[PDB]
Amino acid sequence: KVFGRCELAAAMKRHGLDNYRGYSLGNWVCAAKFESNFNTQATNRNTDGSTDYGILQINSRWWCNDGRTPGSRNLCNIPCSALLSSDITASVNCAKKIVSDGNGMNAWVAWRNRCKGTDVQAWIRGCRL
Ligand SMILES: [Cl-]
Ligand SMILES: [Cl-]
């Protein structure tokens, strides 16, 4: 599923991400825009053989099992395919564990490089939330 901006903002809010660990909703929307262009089915392979999955490009090295990332951990205890669902619930619950692990949203390179220190509120401007 390819979300619209306000559609995704509302789904993220309902799943509890607005100000989760201090990150306003616009951060999460910004991150999803640049990680996946709002596409739940996005996958991208990394040089180390791991793969990033879903709307928030969660990495199989640490967070989910794809059966092909040797010596990886599965810290969200889910198959990575669950992160590609049109229901963002699994991606959000795993994202909550990632952002809580000490490095906050710097875990997402696109957020660090394209969202951090910008007007992220602009990403939810005009949405009925
Ligand atoms: Cl915001
Ligand atoms: Cl980047």
Q: Cα of 112 to ligand 2 centre, how many Å?
A: 7
Q: What is the CA radius of gyration of the chain?
A: 14
18 is in an annotated binding site: no
Pick from 72, 70, 36: which is nearest to 53 by CA? 36
Angle at 87 between CA 76 and CA 103, to 5 degrees: 40
Nearest ligand to the CA of 28 is 1
Q: How far apart are CA 29 and CA 108, in angstroms?
A: 12
Q: Which CATH number fits domain 1-129: 1.10.10.10, 1.10.530.10, 3.40.50.300, 3.90.1150.10?
A: 1.10.530.10
For residue 33, the 8-state DSSP code is: H
Whether 12 contacts 25, CB under 8 Å: yes
**Domain boundaries in the chain?**
1-129
Rounded to the nearest angstrom, the gap between the alpha carbon of residue 65 and the centroid of all alpha carbons in its chain is: 16
The CB density around residue 113, as the number of other CB atoms within 10 Å, is 9
- DSSP readout, 58-127? EETTTT-B-S-STT---TT-SBGGGGGSSSTHHHHHHHHHHHTTTTGGGGSHHHHHHTTTS-GGGGTTT-
Q: Quick one: DSSP state of residue 50?
A: -
Solved using: X-ray
Query: Does residue 56 contact residue 40 with C-beta atoms inside 8 Å?
Result: no
Q: What whole-number distance in Å separates Cα of residue 79 and Cα of residue 104?
A: 23
Give CA angle at 52 (33, 118), nearest 5°. 30
Using the structure block, give the residue that is written with the tokens 């939810």. 124
Strand partners, 58: 53
Tell me, in angstroms, the distance from the centre of ligand 1 to residue 20's CA: 11
